[PDB]
Design a binder for this molecule. Structure first.
Ligand SMILES: O=C(O)C[C@H](NC(=O)c1ncnc2[nH]ccc12)c1ccc(O)cc1
Length: 167
């Protein structure tokens, strides 16, 4: 039993809710929140911009130190950093950005990072400003993640479409 509330169950291990991941993280304080990161951990907009703003830029400060030490992530890769005031940990995961020309096949690799964590609060990878089809992102999520994932979908119209078209 965990603290997530109001989610629709899609599968044994995948759940979905129309919610702002920032407000959801602040309420649940999950062990792991997933950030829709880029390889440079520059949290300028989208989910990443929103999560970083909610940390009063502490996420960005920590991220800049991480990059100065380790260099950029790989597309499809991830790193674990602090969750600051939002969660115990933040799993920064780099889904491919279609608006940069990156291979959509890397989306499965991106979701594989979730399997290293028993329970996660997460957005749909590569959706929104990363330019992929969210219906597809959801299919890959369900077919790749085996741990317990709670998806927060910001847009109500998108959420209703995701549920009504789910196979
Ligand atoms: O629809 C989606 O969920 C994908 C994408 N989502 C986010 O960027 C997002 N997801 C969850 N929590 C969040 N908090 C702040 C941003 C945010 C999106 C959003 C709006 C839109 O019109 C089209 C796609």
């Amino acid at each position: 039993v965990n603290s997530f509330s109001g989610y629709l169950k899609l599968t044994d291990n995948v759940y979905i809710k129309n919610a702002d991941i920032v407000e959801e993280a602040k309420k649940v304080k999950p062990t792991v929140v997933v950030n829709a990161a880029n390889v440079y951990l520059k949290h300028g907009g989208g989910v990443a911009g929103a999560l970083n703003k909610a940390t009063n830029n502490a996420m960005q400060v920590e991220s800049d130190d991480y990059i100065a030490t380790n260099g950029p992530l790989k597309v499809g890769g991830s790193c674990v950093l602090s969750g600051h005031n939002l969660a115990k940990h933040c799993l920064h995961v780099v889904g491919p950005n279609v608006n940069k020309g990156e291979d959509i096949q890397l989306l499965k690799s991106a979701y594989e990072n979730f399997n290293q964590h028993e329970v996660l609060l997460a957005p749909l990878l590569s959706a929104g400003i990363f330019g992929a089809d969210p219906i597809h992102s959801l299919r890959v999520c369900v077919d790749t993640v085996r741990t317990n994932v709670y998806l927060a979908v910001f847009d109500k119209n998108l959420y209703d479409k995701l549920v009504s078209s789910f196979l």
